[PDB]
């Protein structure tokens, strides 16, 4: 009720055993959340990796016109194709 | 604590009707009508010598407070420490109030303004640029306080009494009037505001008058009665004429902060009559000769070349200079405000623009109808 | 008439200099672009005028009309 | 096995930032939501409970859903800092009861008034005569501070279900350590 | 542990039930608010990785 030097000396020492109790595992929870987010980031990169096509490796033989290029695959036939936009 | 309020009942007019109200709202443990009554006690324009009694009561609040918005708590404690008038421990007390609430409410941005606004009297070099920078970096993701920009302008007004502060002050003098909507204070402080607003817009580097300024009604409705010259010198600068009589009468009128800049303002209008005289002729024969600039700007012929290179350097125009005929080509690219009188001829040119295009469509539609399909 | 779709943008400023605060949705220009199948599948749907490429003096004047 | 759409409406106004009670008014109103969402659960699992605010905006935080775990995550950390706005709170709750997935459920709206209302008597009776033409039963529960026997609330309860309506009970809790025992005596079964 | 004793002897009504009722009271309300918000985020991210 009043302010002695005995009760107020023990008024917070019964609390500091609790305020550090709830604070200590908070660093464990944030570390667990941080590793899970890293594991989530590894998962989402594989989802973007899963939507991939693969590209045919070929070599340009000559240039026919401004938009016609005669190319050839490593074993396949010869093609007449063009470029995308800015190549 | 009930005995503390019985002995602190006095020294405020009509005691028991407001101290019986304060003791009952303490017992109901609410904190809003209780708060507005304490704010009513501070707002009371009296001497308010009860700082030593209220600092135990504000201590009695913050023991079991843990509910109250610290925004109103910071806003009410900055008036108390301003009334205590103790610059030795004002900083040590205010930092204690700043660190005791670091919660998710943005009261620390008002505390950093409260640091500077109590500190900007003496020794204003070591931390003032830091605490100016600290507020504007912490003015992100919430443009809804409208008080933190208000107190940021109030410290900038105290920072206006430095050597170099004339451009950022005038730009902040706009932004304070941009965020505020009400006036809520008499004319006897607003007439000094529009006076130093007229000086900051005048003593500037990259500003001519910055139109959509004189339309802003808080300056012309309060100074049309009194001194009648600062509005008039902006009339001549918006018109862009020299008007050597009127710009001399302000030199007789305003004695300080004008003798050191009178050559500058003559320089600022000579680059300003150019964008008026290219506006006088609507691009009919924009190639203006040296005689018309030398007559209008009353400048000699040996300085009209240095005058227009300064104007091309700033960016008010992008023309060229020919001297085989001593005529200046002008491609005006820096537009501004105009009146209703130029609106009228603009519509008549637009009505000519309307009826010429429509007439030629009727000649094309009639001629090429058989091949239209 | 000739009126395409319209888009704005979410911006937060005060207003201009000393005017009271508001939203002022700024305009962003818009265009229409298809994809490869989304453009070839359109031509199969119309089948009424089809508007051939480079015009033989009749479509070009109407493009100026 | 009663089929209704119970729409709970909490208050996170600024006047909730106090404790007239020995616990927190926010903790008092949060446990008030717990004892009614568990009440509507055990009576019929085919109902739905959704929370809505009204302070400074009626932001739909959770849609009216038969799940309760979304609500329990959002009952916490509400941050009450707004100004109470009650006149738009009924119209946004009735607009939520029109956007439903099934039109065979009954209509029940419970609301939590933890702050004094400052509204015209015309604006309450236009909403009251609207809900008479819409056949909508709204319950009003007072929290925290309360003027006893208000003109506005009592005439709104009267003009809600006049001439033998439902019995939308006006809960008038006194300040003190009393919990929701006044809220579980009559309104948990006889609403 | 000398500061824990020395701040209870010189003063009696300055920072005894004043300092201990701010940095413990403002701590535990954040600790109560963050023992659950982190938990509701942690459980939701277990659903996303699953």
Swiss-Prot record, chain B:
GO cellular component: cytosol; extracellular region; ficolin-1-rich granule lumen; membrane; nucleoplasm; nucleus; proteasome accessory complex; proteasome complex
Keyword Acetylation: yes
Keyword Cell cycle: no
GO MF, one annotated term: structural molecule activity
Residue numbers bearing the N6-acetyllysine modification: 295
Residues annotated as domain PCI: 168-335
Keyword annotations from UniProtKB, A to Z: Acetylation, Proteasome
One GO term (biological process): proteasome-mediated ubiquitin-dependent protein catabolic process
SUPFAM superfamilies: Winged helix' DNA-binding domain
SMART domains cross-referenced by the UniProt entry: PINT
Subunit-structure text: Component of the 19S proteasome regulatory particle complex. The 26S proteasome consists of a 20S core particle (CP) and two 19S regulatory subunits (RP). The regulatory particle is made of a lid composed of 9 subunits including PSMD13, a base containing 6 ATPases and few additional components.
Reported function: Component of the 26S proteasome, a multiprotein complex involved in the ATP-dependent degradation of ubiquitinated proteins. This complex plays a key role in the maintenance of protein homeostasis by removing misfolded or damaged proteins, which could impair cellular functions, and by removing proteins whose functions are no longer required. Therefore, the proteasome participates in numerous cellular processes, including cell cycle progression, apoptosis, or DNA damage repair.
Family of this protein: Belongs to the proteasome subunit S11 family.
Protein name, as recorded: 26S proteasome non-ATPase regulatory subunit 13
From Swiss-Prot, chain C:
Chain's gene name: PSMD7
Summary of subunit composition and partner proteins: Component of the 19S proteasome regulatory particle complex. The 26S proteasome consists of a 20S core particle (CP) and two 19S regulatory subunits (RP). The regulatory particle is made of a lid composed of 9 subunits including PSMD7, a base containing 6 ATPases and few additional components. Within the complex, PSMD7 interacts with subunit PSMD4 through their respective MPN domain. Interacts with TRIM5.
Protein family membership: Belongs to the peptidase M67A family.
Miscellaneous remark of the record: Does not bind a metal ion.
Span within the parent record: 131 to 195 of 324
Stated role: Component of the 26S proteasome, a multiprotein complex involved in the ATP-dependent degradation of ubiquitinated proteins. This complex plays a key role in the maintenance of protein homeostasis by removing misfolded or damaged proteins, which could impair cellular functions, and by removing proteins whose functions are no longer required. Therefore, the proteasome participates in numerous cellular processes, including cell cycle progression, apoptosis, or DNA damage repair.
Signal sequence, renumbered to the chain: none
Superkingdom field: Eukaryota
Site of covalent link Glycyl lysine isopeptide (Lys-Gly) (interchain with G-Cter in ubiquitin): 50
Name of the protein described by the UniProt record: 26S proteasome non-ATPase regulatory subunit 7
Upper classification of the organism: Eukaryota, Metazoa, Chordata, Craniata, Vertebrata
UniProtKB/Swiss-Prot annotation, chain D:
Coiled-coil spans in chain: none
Alphabetical GO biological process terms: proteasome-mediated ubiquitin-dependent protein catabolic process
Keywords assigned by UniProt, alphabetized: Isopeptide bond, Phosphoprotein, Proteasome, Repeat, Ubl conjugation
Complex formation: Component of the 19S proteasome regulatory particle complex. The 26S proteasome consists of a 20S core particle (CP) and two 19S regulatory subunits (RP). The regulatory particle is made of a lid composed of 9 subunits, a base containing 6 ATPases and few additional components including PSMD4. Interacts with NUB1. Interacts with SQSTM1. Interacts with UBQLN4. Interacts with UBE3A. Interacts with UBQLN1 (via ubiquitin-like domain). Interacts with DDI2.
GO MF: identical protein binding; molecular adaptor activity; polyubiquitin modification-dependent protein binding; RNA binding
Purpose: Component of the 26S proteasome, a multiprotein complex involved in the ATP-dependent degradation of ubiquitinated proteins. This complex plays a key role in the maintenance of protein homeostasis by removing misfolded or damaged proteins, which could impair cellular functions, and by removing proteins whose functions are no longer required. Therefore, the proteasome participates in numerous cellular processes, including cell cycle progression, apoptosis, or DNA damage repair.
Family named by the database record: Belongs to the proteasome subunit S5A family.
VWFA domain segment(s): 5-188
Crosslink site: Glycyl lysine isopeptide (Lys-Gly) (interchain with G-Cter in SUMO2): 122
Swiss-Prot record, chain E:
Record note on modification: Sumoylated by UBE2I in response to MEKK1-mediated stimuli.
Compartments, as annotated in UniProt: Cytoplasm; Nucleus
Family, as annotated: Belongs to the AAA ATPase family.
Complex and partners: Component of the 19S proteasome regulatory particle complex. The 26S proteasome consists of a 20S core particle (CP) and two 19S regulatory subunits (RP). The regulatory particle is made of a lid composed of 9 subunits, a base containing 6 ATPases including PSMC3 and few additional components. Interacts with PAAF1.
Illness the protein is tied to: Deafness, cataract, impaired intellectual development, and polyneuropathy: An autosomal recessive disease characterized by early onset of deafness, cataract, severe developmental delay, and severely impaired intellectual development. Patients later develop polyneuropathy of the lower extremities, associated with depigmentation of the hair in that area.
Protein name (database record): 26S proteasome regulatory subunit 6A
Lineage: Eukaryota, Metazoa, Chordata, Craniata, Vertebrata
Whole-protein residues included: 25 to 74 of 439
């Amino acid at each position: 009720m009043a302010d002695p030097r005995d009760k107020a000396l023990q008024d917070y020492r019964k609390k500091l055993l609790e305020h550090k109790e709830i604070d200590g595992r908070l660093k464990e929870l944030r570390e667990q959340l941080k590793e899970l987010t890293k594991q989530y980031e590894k998962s989402e990169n594989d989802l973007k990796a899963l939507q991939s096509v693969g590209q045919i490796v070929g070599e340009v033989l000559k240039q026919l016109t401004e938009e016609k290029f005669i190319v050839k695959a490593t074993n396949g036939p010869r093609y007449v194709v063009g470029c995308r936009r800015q190549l | 604590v009930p005995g503390f309020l019985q002995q602190s009942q006095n020294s405020g007019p009509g005691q028991p009707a407001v101290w019986h109200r304060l003791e009952e709202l303490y017992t109901k443990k609410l904190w809003h009508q209780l708060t507005l009554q304490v704010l009513d006690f501070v707002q009371d324009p009296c001497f308010a010598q009860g700082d030593g009694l209220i600092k135990l009561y504000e201590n009695f609040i913050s023991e079991f407070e843990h509910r109250v918005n610290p925004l109103s708590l910071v806003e009410i404690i900055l008036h108390v420490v301003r009334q205590m008038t103790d610059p030795n421990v004002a900083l040590t007390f205010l930092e204690k109030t700043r660190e005791k609430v670091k919660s998710s409410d943005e009261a620390v941005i008002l505390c950093k303004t409260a640091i500077g606004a109590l500190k900007l009297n003496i020794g204003d070099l070591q931390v003032t640029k830091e605490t100016i920078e600290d507020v504007e970096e912490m003015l992100n993701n919430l443009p809804g306080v409208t008080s933190v920009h208000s107190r940021f302008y109030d410290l900038s007004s105290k920072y206006y009494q430095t050597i170099g502060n004339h451009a950022s002050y005038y730009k902040d003098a706009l932004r304070f009037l941009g965020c505020v909507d009400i006036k809520d204070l008499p004319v006897s402080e607003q007439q000094e505001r529009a006076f130093t607003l007229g000086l900051a817009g005048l003593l500037g580097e990259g500003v001519f008058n910055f139109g959509e300024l004189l339309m802003h009604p808080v300056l012309e409705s309060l100074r049309n009665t009194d001194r009648q010259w600062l509005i008039d010198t902006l009339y001549a600068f918006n018109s862009g004429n020299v008007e050597r009589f009127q710009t001399l009468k302000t030199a007789w009128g305003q004695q300080p902060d004008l003798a050191a800049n009178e050559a500058q303002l003559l320089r600022k209008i000579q680059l300003l009559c150019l964008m008026e005289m290219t506006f006088t002729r609507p691009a009919n024969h924009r190639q203006l000769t040296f005689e018309e600039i030398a007559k209008s700007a009353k400048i000699t012929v040996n300085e009209v070349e240095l005058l227009v290179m300064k104007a091309l350097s700033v960016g008010l125009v992008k023309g060229s200079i020919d001297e085989v005929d001593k005529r200046v080509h002008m491609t005006w690219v820096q537009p501004r405000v105009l009146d209703l009188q130029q609106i009228k001829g603009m519509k008549d040119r637009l009505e000519f623009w309307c009826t010429d295009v429509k007439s030629m469509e009727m000649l094309v539609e009639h001629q090429a109808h058989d091949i239209l399909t | 008439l000739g009126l395409p779709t319209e888009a704005y943008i979410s911006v937060e400023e005060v207003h201009d200099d000393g005017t009271p605060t508001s939203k002022t949705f700024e305009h962003v220009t818009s265009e229409i672009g298809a994809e490869e199948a989304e453009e070839v599948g359109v031509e199969h749907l119309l089948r009424d005028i089809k508007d051939t490429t480079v015009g033989t003096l009749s479509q070009r004047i109407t493009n100026q009309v | 096995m009663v089929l209704e759409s119970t729409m709970v409406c909490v208050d996170n106004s600024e006047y909730m930032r106090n404790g007239d009670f020995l616990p927190t008014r926010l903790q008092a109103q949060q446990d008030a939501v717990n004892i009614v969402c568990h009440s509507k659960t055990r009576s019929n699992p085919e109902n739905n409970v959704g929370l809505i605010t009204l302070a400074n905006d009626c932001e739909v935080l959770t849609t009216l859903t038969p799940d309760t775990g979304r609500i329990l995550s959002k009952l916490h950390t509400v941050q009450p800092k707004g100004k109470i706005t009650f006149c738009t709170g009924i119209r946004v709750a009735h607009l939520a009861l029109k956007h439903r997935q099934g039109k065979n459920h009954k209509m029940r709206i419970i609301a939590f008034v933890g702050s004094p209302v400052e509204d015209n008597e015309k604006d309450l009776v236009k909403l009251a005569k609207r809900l008479k033409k819409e056949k909508v039963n709204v319950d009003i529960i007072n929290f925290g501070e309360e003027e006893v026997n208000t003109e506005k609330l009592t005439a709104f309860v009267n003009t809600l279900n006049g001439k033998d309506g439902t019995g939308s009970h006006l809960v008038t809790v006194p300040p003190g350590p009393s919990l929701a025992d006044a809220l579980i005596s009559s309104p948990i079964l006889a609403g | 542990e000398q500061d824990g004793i020395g701040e209870e002897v010189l003063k009696m009504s300055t920072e005894e039930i004043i300092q201990r009722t701010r940095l413990l009271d403002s701590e535990i309300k954040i600790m109560k608010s963050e023992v659950l918000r982190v938990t509701h985020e942690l459980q939701a991210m277990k659903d996303k990785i699953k």
